[PDB]
Design an enzyme around this catalytic site. Structure first.
Site, mmCIF file in Angstrom:
data_model
loop_
_atom_site.group_PDB
_atom_site.id
_atom_site.type_symbol
_atom_site.label_atom_id
_atom_site.label_comp_id
_atom_site.label_asym_id
_atom_site.label_seq_id
_atom_site.Cartn_x
_atom_site.Cartn_y
_atom_site.Cartn_z
ATOM 1 N N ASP A 232 0.861 -1.194 0.000
ATOM 2 C CA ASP A 232 0.000 0.000 0.000
ATOM 3 C C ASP A 232 0.892 1.237 0.000
ATOM 4 O O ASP A 232 2.063 1.157 0.366
ATOM 5 C CB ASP A 232 -0.846 0.120 1.284
ATOM 6 C CG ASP A 232 -1.861 -0.996 1.464
ATOM 7 O OD1 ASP A 232 -2.079 -1.811 0.537
ATOM 8 O OD2 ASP A 232 -2.448 -1.047 2.566
ATOM 9 N N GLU A 503 -14.505 -1.192 4.711
ATOM 10 C CA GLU A 503 -14.737 -1.207 3.270
ATOM 11 C C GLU A 503 -16.146 -1.738 3.007
ATOM 12 O O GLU A 503 -16.501 -2.839 3.448
ATOM 13 C CB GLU A 503 -13.679 -2.069 2.574
ATOM 14 C CG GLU A 503 -12.265 -1.443 2.602
ATOM 15 C CD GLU A 503 -11.165 -2.472 2.461
ATOM 16 O OE1 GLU A 503 -10.002 -2.086 2.168
ATOM 17 O OE2 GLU A 503 -11.454 -3.672 2.658
ATOM 18 N N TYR A 615 -9.208 -9.420 -2.003
ATOM 19 C CA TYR A 615 -10.151 -8.415 -2.498
ATOM 20 C C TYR A 615 -10.745 -8.887 -3.810
ATOM 21 O O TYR A 615 -10.102 -9.637 -4.546
ATOM 22 C CB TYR A 615 -9.471 -7.072 -2.716
ATOM 23 C CG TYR A 615 -9.241 -6.256 -1.459
ATOM 24 C CD1 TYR A 615 -8.839 -6.855 -0.269
ATOM 25 C CD2 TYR A 615 -9.410 -4.882 -1.474
ATOM 26 C CE1 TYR A 615 -8.599 -6.086 0.882
ATOM 27 C CE2 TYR A 615 -9.176 -4.110 -0.347
ATOM 28 C CZ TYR A 615 -8.775 -4.710 0.827
ATOM 29 O OH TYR A 615 -8.554 -3.911 1.934
#
Length: 658
Positions: A232, A503, A615
């Site tokens: 990230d 999320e 994800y």
């Protein structure tokens, strides 16, 4: 060349198969290629598919093996005790197990090249490792090799690493076949790649997939193109997009939706060793986490993503500063000039850089690309490139001048080191994207930006309302536009979590009724509901029947257009595991029309419970198939950092799921 050996339909049922007589006297010279098509849908924890060994007493560490783990990892060992060589090369998350309930035929190609002193492994058309050594060991030159074995390694006369699976085809060649020749070997992949190493992005890594079906039938995908390994931000990351006009069968060469040029677009093989794997590009600006929606009214496609200034990420972003100054009810981006210890500047209308101490404009303007102009002339900075030539990460000037951007480390004027949300739009369904604009702050002057929920925004069916979910400490913050994304307002919904990565993705159950599914820290996926098109939100409930880890994982969700078992249906995509990001499932839920409760009726295993799944993105294709773009690896595990071509796309039909 022809193979020196070729065999097939070997069943490996925890009992090795001896092929010594057929193979050993065929091996010659120091270079070899193994081509193997194999299935393993119920593998043991650690098993050898192929072995060449010295089976004699006292030589248990003299062998070559191709092995796999029930994690999906593939590797080789090449060992010779007299030579003092014990090579172990491997990569996690390299395999498929099952697709649509049927065992997947994996295609493995291992190249042992004596001339280049390099060992290279491909699985399913993807290079998973390539390693050069100073002292090369030909797999056939191991001292006293006397056994060639399928489904075990013979050590001191016993079967080690016994396999369960099948080898439908195996060929060996007394040559190191070229990368070109490898590319001609027919595959039986259950998946395809949209983004991949070596494509137009020149990123070696991808994370955070999205999918969205446009009204024209075109399917659009966005992604983090990540350059400095899979880390990230802080890093170098751009947002890339690709579309399909044929229901996902083929995909366009990617283009950028959002990009910075302070650092070069470099395809880099990021180190995976424990000493260096946490190397991180530390002076680059980046984008991270994208989300897409289509606006029925204007016809435009809208893409949002987080924006990080140079060297900034979630970790070190100023949480107490929006980066904007309020002056008379309006918000202006603050700037700091080279030498100052405060932010004494703002960007006003028409991009005019204003001096806050003297209250007058300057001779500087910011253009539509957030680039610095002086008296109308473009200023520049020198670009950086990265390398590990010195044995550690170096970031250094490369001689190239690029436009000076306020998000850059080397810029004369710099933005507040915190996180922002930007939006861009496309008027041609993803063939080109406009320059991005920063969204205003929603939670006041002294609050950092909220964090975009990756995936899809929601276009309400009975209005022109557009909603993008975001999150921050203590709430979901829905961003709402009724004018095609020209202006936004927030709608806050409290959640019983301080500092969660909540999320969230939304579906419209029926007209005006929105259910949001979100990641928590409880091990269960949560949800909340709005019945007034996002103005107000219910309390939080939880789904039983799906497990997540304590840290949680993004969940994607769609409302299917067709009835299933006579009912309205919602499909969720998530790992189903309390242990790691693995056990990927699509879970089909049927809506109870009396209370809008959902009965989670079908669970479809995307691949093995032990195989990686993080994800994900799901969409109903125009032909009513389901497209799934997902990270096929454990994106939390610190053992699975920096893997290439693990974001993969599959096509499913509803009958496969039910």
């Amino acid at each position: 060349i022809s193979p020196i050996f070729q065999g097939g339909s070997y069943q490996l049922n925890n009992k090795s198969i001896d092929i010594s007589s057929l193979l050993l006297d065929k091996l010659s010279g120091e270079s070899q290629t193994v081509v193997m098509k194999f299935k393993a849908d119920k593998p043991n924890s650690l098993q050898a598919l192929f072995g060449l060994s010295n089976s004699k007493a006292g030589f248990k560490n003299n062998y070559f093996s191709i092995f796999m783990r029930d994690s999906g990892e593939i590797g080789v060992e090449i060992r010779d005790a007299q030579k003092g060589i014990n090579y172990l090369f491997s990569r996690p998350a390299s395999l498929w197990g099952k697709h649509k309930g049927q065992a997947v035929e994996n295609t493995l190609v291992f190249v042992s090249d004596s001339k280049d002193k390099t060992y290279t492994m491909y699985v399913n058309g993807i290079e998973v490792f390539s390693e050069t050594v100073d002292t090369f060991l030909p797999i056939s030159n191991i001292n006293g090799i006397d056994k060639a074995t399928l489904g075990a390694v013979n050590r001191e006369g016993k079967e080690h690493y016994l396999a369960k699976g099948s080898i439908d085809e195996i060929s060996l060649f007394n040559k190191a076949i070229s990368d070109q020749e490898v590319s001609t070997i027919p595959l039986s992949n259950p998946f395809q790649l949209i983004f991949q190493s070596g494509d137009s992005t020149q990123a070696n890594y991808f994370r955070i997939p999205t999918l969205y079906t446009l009204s024209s039938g075109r399917v659009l995908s966005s992604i983090d193109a990540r350059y400095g390994g899979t880390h990230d931000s802080k890093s170098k990351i751009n947002i890339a997009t690709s579309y399909s006009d044929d229901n996902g069968k083929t995909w366009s060469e990617p283009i950028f939706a959002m990009k910075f040029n302070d650092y070069e677009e470099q395809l880099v093989y990021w180190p995976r060793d424990n000493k260096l794997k946490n190397s991180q590009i530390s002076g680059s600006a980046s984008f991270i986490d994208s989300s897409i929606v289509e606006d029925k009214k204007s016809g435009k496609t809208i893409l949002l993503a987080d924006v990080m200034p140079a060297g900034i990420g979630n970790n070190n972003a100023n949480k107490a500063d929006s980066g904007f100054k309020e002056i008379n009810g309006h918000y202006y981006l603050k700037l700091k000039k080279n030498g100052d210890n405060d932010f004494r500047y703002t960007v006003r209308e028409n991009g005019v850089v204003y001096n806050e101490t003297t209250n007058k404009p300057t001779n500087y303007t910011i253009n539509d690309k957030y680039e610095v102009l002086e008296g109308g002339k473009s200023l520049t900075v020198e670009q950086y490139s990265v390398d590990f030539d010195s044995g550690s990460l170096r970031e250094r000037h490369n001689g190239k001048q690029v436009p000076m951007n306020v998000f850059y480390k080397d810029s004369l004027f710099k933005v507040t080191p915190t996180n922002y949300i930007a939006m861009t739009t496309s008027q041609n369904r993803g063939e080109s994207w406009e320059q991005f604009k920063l969204l205003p702050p929603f939670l006041g002057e002294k609050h950092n930006g909220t964090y975009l929920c990756p995936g899809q925004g929601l276009a309400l069916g009975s209005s022109n309302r557009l909603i993008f979910a975001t999150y921050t400490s203590g709430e979901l913050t829905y961003l709402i536009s009724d004018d095609s994304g020209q202006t936004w307002k927030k709608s806050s919904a409290s959640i019983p979590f301080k500092n969660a990565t909540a999320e969230a993705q939304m579906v419209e159950l029926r007209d005006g009724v929105i259910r949001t599914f979100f990641r928590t820290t409880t091990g269960k996926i949560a949800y909340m509901t709005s019945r007034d098109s996002g103005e107000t939100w219910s309390k939080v409930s939880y789904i039983d029947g799906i497990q997540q880890t304590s840290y949680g994982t993004q969940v994607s969700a769609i409302k299917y257009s067709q009835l299933i078992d006579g009912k309205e249906a919602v499909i969720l995509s998530t790992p189903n595991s309390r242990s790691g990001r693995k056990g990927g499932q699509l879970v089909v839920g049927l809506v109870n029309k009396e209370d809008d409760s959902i009965d989670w009726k079908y669970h479809y295993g995307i691949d093995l419970p032990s195989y990686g799944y993080a994800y994900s993105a799901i969409t109903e294709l125009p032909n009513h198939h389901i497209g799934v773009l997902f990270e096929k690896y454990d994106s939390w595990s610190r053992n699975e950092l920096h893997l290439s071509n693990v974001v993969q796309y599959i096509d499913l039909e509803i009958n496969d799921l039910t």
